[PDB]
């Protein structure tokens, strides 16, 4: 089985007053609604497991609950919330941990992420290159280096794994601030594999990616 | 003074429009046209030199030439267009590579590249934390690494630079299909600062980006 788990349950900052960025409204329906839509498209996720702020546990449920979908409440962190939504994944073979504000992430390219990892490989992320050069900077904003843009890959989600290999890395070091999972399990030197992302799955938290997204929503429905 | 070098000689493949990019529309407007009234907006830039693909130079220098408003032809690739430019940066001691491409950049970005050359820094690149996780990877698309976020720069242009070094780095330049102007710099080992970048100078690349730009314009 494939299990799909999505942190939706809080915000580091402020601003949000604890309001996750799943939750914002893209054409009048929530961000999380989108995300659990191209899950249940793809067609290869089995079940899908939400973390969501404990207060809004049972409003969740009612909104986003389903033959295929559970509802837990979330941690203090992100690494709290994902590991929470480990507990209720059961006995899957693959974990894929899914963004939420990546609500416009087609399809196909969660199935690509599945397709990989039943070719054999045990982490599997997608990724583009880097629209813009990338350079490392020291604390003081100077130059590092700039390693060559074609090695480089803007990651994004769902990042699918064997699912012991992602509750071994869960099992150790809280440090809430990681919002990557591959990175936990590349601490051992385990292989990931990059597959082809999507512009379309980007991030959506700022007003400018907002704007991006609604218009998106027009192209493809008026 | 400063001079601003527009490398503008691309062509228009990727956003499938059968025109250079710089000749595609935002809200009825050419992108060039909107890349140089950034930088007439600005209020910081004396002297404007555009790379335009070779067979639009003289067309080109009938529409946009004049005193301080400079038409060369491009090159093959990007580094040529802007070794190419130079030749014509003139006087200024302050030189700016900025893309037609990132038409939407503020003039306010613009004058803080400008304002950091000024202070003393020889060369200067906007930048912002990148919005995806950025990871090292091989030729086979495995992970090597993953640097923090947090002590890296998605780099937009203006790049701006004390003009001798930029004359300096592009002469040691031994081939094209280099982007990064500062990535030229780098290998004098001239140190190089980054200042706040700003989302609005995202460069017009695929026609998502066109959609993008054509939002933002449409919002005002
Ligand atoms: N307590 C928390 C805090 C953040 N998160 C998740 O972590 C990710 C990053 O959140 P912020 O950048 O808003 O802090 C989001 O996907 C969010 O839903 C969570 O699931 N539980
Ligand atoms: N041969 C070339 C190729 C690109 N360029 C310019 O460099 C910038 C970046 O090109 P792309 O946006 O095509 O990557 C654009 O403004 C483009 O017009 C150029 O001036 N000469």
Request: glycine share 10%.
């Amino acid at each position: 089985a494939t299990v799909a788990v999505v942190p939706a349950a809080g915000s580091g900052e402020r601003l949000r007053a604890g309001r996750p960025k799943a939750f914002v409204t893209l054409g009048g329906t929530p961000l999380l609604e989108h995300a659990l839509s191209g899950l249940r498209a793809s067609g290869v996720i089995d079940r899908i497991v939400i973390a969501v702020p404990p207060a809004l546990t049972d409003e969740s449920k009612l909104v986003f609950g389903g033959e295929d979908s559970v509802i837990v409440s979330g941690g203090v962190d992100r690494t709290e919330s994902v590991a929470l939504a480990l507990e209720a994944a059961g006995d899957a073979e693959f974990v894929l941990v899914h963004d939420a504000a990546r609500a416009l992430t087609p399809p196909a390219l969660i199935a690509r992420v599945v397709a990989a990892l039943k070719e054999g490989h045990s982490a599997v992320v997608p990724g583009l290159a880097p629209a813009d050069t990338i350079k490392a900077v020291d604390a003081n904003g100077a130059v590092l280096g700039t390693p060559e843009r074609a090695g480089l890959r803007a990651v994004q989600t769902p990042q699918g794994f064997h699912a012991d290999v992602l509750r071994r890395a869960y099992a150790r070091a809280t440090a809430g601030g990681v919002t990557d999972d591959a990175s936990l399990v590349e601490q051992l030197g385990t292989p990931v594999q990059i597959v082809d992302g999507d512009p379309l799955a980007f991030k959506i938290t700022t007003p400018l990616d907002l704007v991006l997204a609604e218009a998106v929503l027009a192209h493809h429905h008026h």
